[PDB]
Structure formats: structure tokens, C-alpha cells
Design a protein around this ligand. Structure first.
Ligand SMILES: OC[C@H]1O[C@@H](O[C@H]2[C@H](O)[C@@H](O)[C@H](O[C@H]3[C@H](O)[C@@H](O)[C@H](O[C@H]4[C@H](O)[C@@H](O)[C@H](O)O[C@@H]4CO)O[C@@H]3CO)O[C@@H]2CO)[C@H](O)[C@@H](O)[C@@H]1O
Ligand SMILES: *[C@@H]1O[C@H](CO)[C@@H](O)[C@H](O)[C@H]1NC(C)=O
Ligand SMILES: [Cl-]
Ligand SMILES: [Cu+2]
Length: 235
């Protein structure tokens, strides 16, 4: 259980974005039905009033929280990968429009899942804004918690992979558009019961054997990181 509070741009807090520039759900309950419109931007997908200004090469940092900002972020049990996708706001998240900018499952070195490092990062994880066409975008941050992903939701609707999905409204002003955005995947649609990384037993199988759901990170992506980039306690 976890939600996005707001974003930082180049380490500068953009302030509370909930129902302002985040298309926020009414609570932190997971999405589990892979076929549901809820897979797009969670259970309350509607244009909210603001879109955060950024330029290509900016560092955009998502800040997640559990109950209160900068609390324990998400339950330690919710081991799993973290992905970020982008779509033209034009799409409203409909059609084959979602392009992956970031994937992080398990770091063999430190033996921590992306979710583990997010808690350590005080809920902060980032992507570098790609050189797409200036315009309005949705950035879809996705945490997959696998603490019950040994089952499928479609077979046993009280278990299954859990998706914490947050769409941010981002306006890209300055960009040379050196990497125009391709068509991407649909959500709902890209994840099915068969898709690798959806059904997996973190209790019996080693985390090094884990393979995150496709698609692969777009060649136009400029990477990203899970790490604190500023102190919410001083805001
Ligand atoms: O630990 C391995 C074990 O995990 C089992 O699943 C557990 C989870 O480990 C546990 O973290 C999870 O806790 C949930 C709880 O069910 C929710 O009701 C609660 O929701 C809260 C929310 O936290 C608050 O933020 C909000 O304000 O209120 C709601 C109350 O409605 O959130 C916590 C997580 O934060 O519970 C699971 C059991 O249901 C697996 O089942 C098992 O297979 C594993 O072995
Ligand atoms: C999953 O969502 C689809 C589409 O909204 C719906 O038809 C189906 O009833 C849902 N499954 C469950 C278990 O509710
Ligand atoms: Cl749970
Ligand atoms: Cu939870």
C-alpha cells in the first residue's frame, strides 16, 4: 500500500501534487485485475488541473508515501520491481501508447529489490526526461509487489501480483526532440497471466532468477535511479 505525494525537478520539490498534477486514487489499495481500465492510471483516471514544467535532461523524481509524507513509504513485505512509462497526454492512457523509460527488479550486489531501495530512498526514484517532442505527457510509475504473486488474481482473486500505479501530468517545454516517442503498449493489455514476472514465488525461487514483465526499456530512455534527491522534512 503506497501513493505518490508529488515530484521534484532537479532536486526542487514541486509541492503537494495529489489530485493537482497526480491523477491520484482515493486510497493506496493495489490494482490486481490485469484486464481492468484501472491498470491505466489507477481507479480515478481524469485530467487534473496542473502539469509540471520540465525540459529534456531534467531529473524528475517521484515521491511515494504510505499514510503521511516521508513515513515508512510501503510495507517491507511488498518486495518487487519498479518501472516508469511515458505516454502522450493526447492518449489519456488509451491505445498502444505506453513507452518504458525505466526498469529495476533486483540488485545482486546489495541483494535488495527496487521496493527495498525505495523505502531506503524515502520513497524517491527518478528518470532523466527524454528528448521527445515538446508537449503534454503522462509519466506512469508502477510498483509491482509480489508478496502474493505466487497465485494469479484471475484464478484466486484474494491473491495475485499487486500494481501501485501513479500517473503524473508532465509538460515538456524545451527539447530538441532528438528522440521522437514511438508507439508503446496498452495498459490494460501488456500484462497477461502468461507474461514473465507476473506469476512468481519470491518465497521458493531466488530473486536473481526473477525476470520483470516486458516491454524492454526504450533506446531513447536516459535511465534513472532509486535514491533520495531532497529532504521533505525541511519542506
Ligand atoms: O509477509 C509475507 C506474507 O505476506 C502476506 O501478505 C500480507 C502482507 O505482508 C502485509 O504487508 C499486508 O498488509 C497490508 C494489509 O493487508 C492492509 O489491510 C493494509 O491496508 C491499510 C493501509 O496500510 C493503510 O495505509 C490504510 O490507511 O488503511 C488500510 C486498511 O484498510 O496495508 C498493509 C500493508 O501496508 O497484509 C498481507 C496479508 O493480507 C502474504 O499473504 C503471505 O503469502 C506472505 O507469506
Ligand atoms: C476485471 O475487469 C474487467 C474489465 O473491467 C471486468 O469485466 C471483470 O469483471 C473484472 N474481474 C473481476 C474479478 O472483477
Ligand atoms: Cl496486501
Ligand atoms: Cu500493500
Amino acid at each position: 500500500h503506497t501513493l505518490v505525494w508529488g515530484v521534484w525537478v532537479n532536486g526542487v520539490d514541486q509541492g503537494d501534487g495529489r489530485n493537482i498534477y497526480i491523477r491520484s486514487p482515493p486510497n493506496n489499495n493495489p490494482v490486481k485485475n490485469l484486464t481492468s481500465p484501472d491498470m491505466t492510471c489507477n481507479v480515478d483516471n481524469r485530467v487534473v488541473p496542473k502539469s509540471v514544467p520540465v525540459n529534456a535532461g531534467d531529473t524528475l523524481t517521484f515521491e511515494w508515501y504510505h499514510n503521511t509524507r516521508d513515513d515508512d513509504i510501503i510495507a517491507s513485505s511488498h518486495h518487487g520491481p519498479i518501472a516508469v512509462y511515458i505516454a502522450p497526454a493526447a492518449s489519456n492512457g488509451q491505445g498502444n501508447v505506453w513507452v518504458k523509460l525505466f526498469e529495476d527488479a533486483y540488485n545482486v550486489t546489495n541483494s535488495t529489490w527496487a521496493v527495498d531501495r525505495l523505502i531506503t530512498a524515502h520513497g524517491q526514484h527518478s528518470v532523466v526526461v527524454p528528448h521527445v517532442a515538446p508537449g503534454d505527457y503522462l509519466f506512469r510509475a508502477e510498483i509491482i509487489a509480489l508478496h502474493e504473486a505466487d497465485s494469479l488474481y484471475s484464478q484466486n482473486p484474494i491473491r495475485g501480483a499487486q500494481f501501485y500505479i501513479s500517473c503524473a501530468q508532465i509538460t515538456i517545454n524545451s527539447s530538441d526532440d532528438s528522440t521522437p516517442l514511438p508507439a508503446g503498449v496498452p495498459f490494460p493489455g501488456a500484462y497477461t497471466d502468461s507474461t514473465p514476472g507476473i506469476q512468481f514465488n519470491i518465497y521458493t525461487t531466488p530473486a536473481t532468477s526473477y525476470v520483470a514483465p516486458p516491454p524492454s526499456v526504450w533506446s531513447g530512455a536516459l535511465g534513472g535511479s532509486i535514491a533520495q534527491v531532497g529532504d521533505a522534512s525541511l519542506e
